[PDB]
């Protein structure tokens, strides 16, 4: 079992600053890029920043909306990643998660920060029954999804608990059940549950890579009835 544990959130004023931390265990932290992703009720899941390896001179990339305000950093000797947030706006309100590995297998529990273009489209909702085959899809406004978009699929359950299921289009994350599969189908990425189970009732997000950033979809609510 991998663990990621975030800390440092709170209740801050517009214009304020804050630093978030995340400490990792159970995997070789220094061999993997790390990311910060935030969830807000209005804007959904939003990728914020990545930091690469020592051998990449710790290269970083940022969402356009935080560029020049946020700084991501890491300390491999403490297995920790940080996000320094300056000039906070109301818009920055959300739950902040550190996440990485192939490419979003592992997620921390999140830390809440309250301050007071490519579109990726998913089905808003789908309804199935136990034992059915259900396929969720992820389309890009740019055109076709290909293997160069490295489609990831992540599952959210109560309460704001995330786990990665699929990365690199069709690679199952370790310990992910066999009933989950990733594919490319008619120029969309797709997640298939072959024999849905009641516990699969959840929100499913896709993420697509465009050269030096991730764009998350809006999520699909999957209901499993009967």
């Amino acid at each position: 079992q991998v663990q990621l544990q975030e800390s440092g959130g709170g209740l801050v004023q517009p214009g304020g600053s804050m630093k978030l931390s995340c400490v990792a265990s159970g995997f070789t932290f220094s061999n993997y890029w790390m990311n910060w992703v935030r969830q807000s009720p209005e804007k959904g899941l939003e990728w914020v920043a990545e930091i690469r390896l020592k051998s990449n001179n710790y290269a970083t990339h940022y969402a356009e909306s935080v560029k020049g305000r946020f700084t991501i950093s890491r300390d491999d000797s403490k297995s920790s990643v940080y996000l320094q947030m300056n000039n906070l706006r109301a818009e920055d309100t959300g739950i902040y998660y550190c996440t990485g590995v192939g490419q979003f297998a592992y997620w921390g529990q999140g830390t809440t920060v309250t301050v007071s273009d490519i579109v990726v489209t998913q089905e808003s909702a789908l309804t199935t029954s136990p034992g059915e085959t259900v396929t969720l899809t992820c389309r890009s406004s740019t055109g076709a999804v290909t293997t160069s978009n490295y489609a990831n699929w992540v599952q959210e359950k109560p309460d704001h608990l995330f786990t990665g299921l699929i990365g690199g289009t069709n690679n199952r994350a370790p310990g992910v059940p066999a009933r989950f599969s990733g594919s490319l189908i008619g120029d969309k990425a797709a997640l298939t549950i072959t024999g849905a189970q009641t516990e699969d009732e959840a929100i499913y997000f896709c993420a697509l890579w465009y050269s030096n950033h991730w764009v998350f979809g809006g999520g699909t609510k999957l209901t499993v009835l009967g």
Binding site: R52, G102, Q103, Y150, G168, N171, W209
Partner: peptide, 6 residues
């Protein structure tokens, strides 16, 4: 292109 280490 992203982190494709397994």
């Amino acid at each position: 292109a992203p982190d494709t280490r397994p």
